[PDB]
Design a protein around this ligand. Structure first.
Ligand SMILES: Cc1cc2nc3c(=O)[nH]c(=O)nc-3n(C[C@H](O)[C@H](O)[C@H](O)COP(=O)(O)OP(=O)(O)OC[C@H]3O[C@@H](n4cnc5c(N)ncnc54)[C@H](O)[C@@H]3O)c2cc1C
Ligand SMILES: Cc1cc2nc3c(=O)[nH]c(=O)nc-3n(C[C@H](O)[C@H](O)[C@H](O)COP(=O)(O)OP(=O)(O)OC[C@H]3O[C@@H](n4cnc5c(N)ncnc54)[C@H](O)[C@@H]3O)c2cc1C
Lengths: 607, 609
């Protein structure tokens, strides 16, 4: 088959047997969607991913997009455009779209499980297909007049972009200098140059593109608070009929040459620099840009984390399939006998160590993003967790930098084990794992770098939150710990929870002490990424142990065959993760408890 | 970037002279005619050549990779890369460390590998193509008197060379190879088989000949590696007296792989005796001793790969640092709430300083490891700088090679992630060299033996079979440093814990091996923990060597260092302190994890994965 190896079985296990999402299916908003239909949808998009979506994976990398300076457009390889048409023809770009825009109501947890397959098979294909979802965001934030445009945009399937970054404004969005000048008719003329813009042109995939552009109105204050958000279409159009009109003054000037994700055109985008104005419409006709734009950034960060996790998953399953068939060496119990029978490499302890590491992290990460998604619907959060709308929103906000920051970093790191499993053949383009590594390196950078994820997590999702979302999650872990075959895992989880609590307390002390000793805040910066990663490891270990508790129940109840194999794997992975990953958090806590400012005081010239 | 390569001669000289005292042998005995000043000038000269003509084709080789003609069985290399190769040849750099009688300049191994570091940082495939004369010397050492004559010709004419072991079914398990050798009445052999992944098996018109050193199994010989012999298989027949090139020998490249990185090194399927023309080979030394002879080559390849990974991390770090110094983004963390505060360069951010010091300490600790290892590769150097006799020196070098290779490869690739991250989104661009550093260095944990093979060699051969003598010598040196100003008190305390952790790891794994006398399956626990053990020893050596560098830096600062010297020495202190406090303590948890390994993951049904 294709490079892409999917895991619907593990998705269904999470959605139904672990988190109970099927309990909201058929009820209230999800009245028209039953469990059987949900599973059928997952199987169908999994097949679409393994078939026509994956088919262009290699071609998009080997035959990458080309920028045409004669027209200021990008050309895409024909095989990739065929994959995109398969996505559209199936309606899959309406996944999770509101009913009034033509979508099928469904839990976010199911929505992201569906999207995981596209992200594993050809993740740029989902990015080009985020248009309808961006039009929903524009709808929710728009005026009544603007809601009619957004509806046209979704119905016609226009592409979309989020346009923030400039050459001098990446992590520091507030330093952007793209300008907005209001016109007599109430429109605005956008003037500036933006950098690194995903899908800024898309060949003839769509008839229009909606750029959602951050820009500073003349006279506005500084920083992100002075930014406003503007609807800037590639083509003008009839606000009533949608008929496509004259070109708007927003042009791609370049396409970047990247380590991976090559088929995703990443472009410099100039507004108002080529002889015609870039007409923009103030979104919601209010000046509230960074808040409006963060509706998009939140979705982007969930996507990027899910992408990295989807990619580790198919990397692991490729490595596993390879190991099952590769004969090399004799069994270690016979290593001195040079005529002992040769064995497949799954018989080697280091290879089984590497495979169980890939398995536990991939499945642990899938549980984390699905768990996160169960807090993105008020109804789901109430039904499956018993938490009200407000707490659910805070818990989701707490978890998103884990999905994004911990997911992106872990996936790239563990793909190294996936490649190692193939031996020298892992280094060949004949196998997909080296492209998996190249495509996923970007996941720790776009949508906010890991450092920005860890700062958000601590300063905004914990401290500003007064620790309420965090205390809720810690209480669910402690409950699991308080509760035989899982006694050892629960004891190791208790140590890990205490370690994370100790880290949180040390860093809170460093931050609070900054009122009287300004440089003490640096120790928060020094520890923040390690803290984010430790929380991810704790969550992984907890969710895997929860999976193993369900697996124990199902084995006791008499599971057989392929079911039984699956459940035995969950017990093995939870135990391996508890005994080989969680203990490192104790030394990390002690490291964080002894952080100092020596490295901050060192002369830059000493580096 | 074109001038991507950023060198660190100053750190090399610091190690060679101020830390290890390699200059004590310069101008005495085997090195009587090379003085410390000439050594420094050689380092500066190859570093400049590497930063200019050698690095100039680094990007070209990746973007315009070699092309294979399957009818002629040859590859075409990009012109800019061949021009790089000629600058290397014109400077005599393919003859660094070559024996005097082969045209080399005698020098200690530590200096030789310091010189090569620059080629490996600037364009590592160029050094790989240039390893022919080094192989000539190994052939000379193992050959008959007549063969020594050929090796002398090959070295003087600068012939290329390959090491030909791997087959589709024989990679890690070299002894499974099926390539055969068929003896001829006149005493030559005809080699028959297909080999795979052969580096430099063709190289366009760089050389007038290529010496393929080929492992093959004589007809009727036993199985495993012990049945293999090593054969000299030239690309062209030649006149054995004069070296004049003759008729094409029957050994032909039949494929060239498409790889993630290191693209300009042609990695080839090599067909012997398959095109109706015999592949004539000459038994090396006219004895049957192939795996032992070939490990002379493997030892050098493993050293080169480790040094390659370390060279690449260090130019990766230096690129990241120069970017960070100039990139303005955000406010100082002490002013994060004030949205009007001045913007600062990103070296002001704690996480970037963490990133950079992690890159620095590992790059410099790794440099110290391979230079330390090389001080045991000459008996005269090992005697002068360490006081150890030739036998212990060999065992210590043998212990440290899988660390250089295994820990070097794995560490450099992982810390280049920090390098790339320092550039932000720009780091993902081919406009900057880090992404190619990552791709080019992924191979280093794989060729010349995978990390798992390195860790298995380390434990079973270099510790257990060695009866722990080399490990005990090194541990005793670390203990002696810990025992000896109190300004490094915290570091020595952290090193004492790390040393105890590593000794605990060794004891548990040894215990698992002892238990295997009673329950064979207990040996799996050694397998499960072996790579983590190898990486723990590398971290311990990193931390110890950095701390010794800090003790030297404190002396030099106390004596009154100023300016750039002062800053260099301050950075050593900071790096040793940072590494001890942020890297070493994790070894405690790793020791506890190794003490609790079990066979659950071994007993699990394969179907459950
Ligand atoms: C493939 C790709 C696609 C992209 N697509 C889009 C898109 O569609 N739309 C869009 O708007 N943008 C897009 N971007 C921009 C992207 O989000 C930025 O690259 C990212 O936010 C980082 O900004 P930067 O590149 O300027 O790096 P910098 O902000 O310059 O960061 C450099 C380094 O400094 C560190 N750093 C910076 N500030 C701080 C701080 N305050 N504290 C601690 N550390 C700090 C960072 O962690 C990093 O290590 C894309 C980028 C890429 C690579
Ligand atoms: C770029 C490149 C250049 C090369 N150049 C050369 C060259 O010039 N000359 C040459 O002779 N070879 C060369 N090789 C071959 C290279 O050395 C082998 O790829 C390497 O030894 C691994 O062998 P393999 O690829 O068959 O992997 P395998 O041996 O199939 O290994 C697959 C996996 O199983 C593991 N494994 C295998 N056996 C064991 C065991 N006993 N215990 C535990 N784990 C085990 C490995 O660690 C790995 O994770 C080259 C390879 C590459 C990629």
């Amino acid at each position: 088959m294709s490079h892409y190896k999917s895991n619907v079985r593990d998705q269904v296990f999470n959605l139904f047997e672990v988190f109970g999402v099927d309990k909201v299916l058929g009820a209230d908003k999800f009245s028209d969607l039953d469990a059987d239909t949900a599973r059928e949808m997952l199987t169908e998009i999994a097949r679409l991913a393994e078939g026509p979506i994956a088919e262009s994976f290699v071609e998009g990398d080997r035959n990458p997009p080309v920028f045409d300076p004669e027209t200021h457009t990008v050309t895409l390889p024909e095989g990739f455009k065929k994959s995109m048409r398969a996505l559209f023809d199936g309606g899959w770009d309406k996944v999770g779209l509101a009913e009034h825009l033509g979508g099928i109501p469904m839990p976010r947890a199911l929505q992201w499980a569906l999207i995981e397959h596209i992200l594993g098979a050809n993740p740029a294909a989902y990015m080009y297909a985020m248009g309808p979802g961006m039009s929903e965001i524009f709808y929710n934030n728009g005026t009544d007049e603007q809601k009619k445009w957004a509806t046209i945009a979704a119905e016609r399937g226009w592409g979309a972009t989020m346009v923030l970054t400039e050459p001098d404004a990446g992590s520091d969005v507030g330093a952007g200098r793209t300008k907005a000048v209001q016109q007599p008719d109430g429109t605005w003329h956008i003037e500036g140059v933006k950098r690194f813009i995903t899908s800024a042109d898309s060949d003839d995939l769509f008839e229009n593109i909606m750029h959602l552009v951050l820009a500073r109105p003349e006279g506005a204050g500084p920083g992100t608070k002075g930014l406003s958000l503007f609807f800037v279409p590639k083509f003008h159009f009839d606000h009533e009929t949608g008929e496509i009109g004259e070109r708007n003054g927003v042009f791609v000037t370049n396409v970047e040459h990247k380590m991976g994700l090559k088929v995703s055109a990443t472009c410099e985008l100039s507004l108002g620099q080529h002889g015609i104005p870039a007409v923009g419409w103030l979104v919601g006709e209010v000046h509230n840009g960074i808040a409006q734009m963060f509706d998009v950034i939140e979705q982007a960060r969930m996507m990027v984390g899910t992408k990295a996790i989807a990619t580790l998953s198919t990397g692991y399953l490729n490595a596993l399939e390879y190991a099952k068939e590769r004969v090399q060496g004799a069994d270690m119990t016979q290593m001195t006998d040079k005529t002992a029978p040769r064995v497949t490499i799954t018989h080697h302890p280091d290879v089984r160590r590497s495979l169980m590491t890939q398995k536990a992290y991939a499945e642990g990460l899938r549980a984390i993003y699905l768990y996160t998604a169960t807090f993105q619907d008020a109804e789901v959060a109430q039904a499956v967790h018993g938490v009200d709308g407000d707490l659910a929103a805070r818990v989701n906000d707490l978890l998103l930098p884990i999905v994004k920051g911990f997911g992106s970093e872990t996936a790239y790191a563990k793909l190294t084990e996936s490649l190692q499993t193939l031996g020298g053949s892992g280094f060949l383009q004949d196998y997909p794992i080296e492209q998996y590594i190249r495509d996923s390196k970007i996941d720790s950078l776009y949508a906010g770098t890991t450092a920005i994820q860890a700062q958000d997590f601590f300063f905004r999702k914990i401290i500003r939150d007064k620790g309420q979302a965090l205390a809720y999650v810690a209480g669910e872990i402690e409950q699991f710990i308080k509760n035989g075959r899982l006694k050892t895992e629960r004891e190791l989880l208790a140590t890990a929870l205490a370690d994370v609590q100790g880290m949180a307390a040390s860093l809170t002390g460093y931050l609070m002490a900054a009122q009287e000793d300004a440089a003490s805040i640096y120790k928060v910066g020094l520890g923040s990424v390690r803290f984010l990663m430790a929380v991810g490891d704790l969550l992984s270990g907890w969710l895997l142990a929860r999976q193993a508790a369900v697996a124990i129940e199902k084995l006791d109840a008499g599971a057989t065959g392929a079911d039984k194999s699956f459940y035995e794997g969950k017990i093995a992975a939870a135990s391996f993760f508890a005994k080989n990953m969680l203990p490192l958090l104790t030394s990390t806590r002690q490291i964080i408890e002894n952080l100092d400012n020596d490295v901050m005081e060192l002369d830059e010239a000493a580096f």
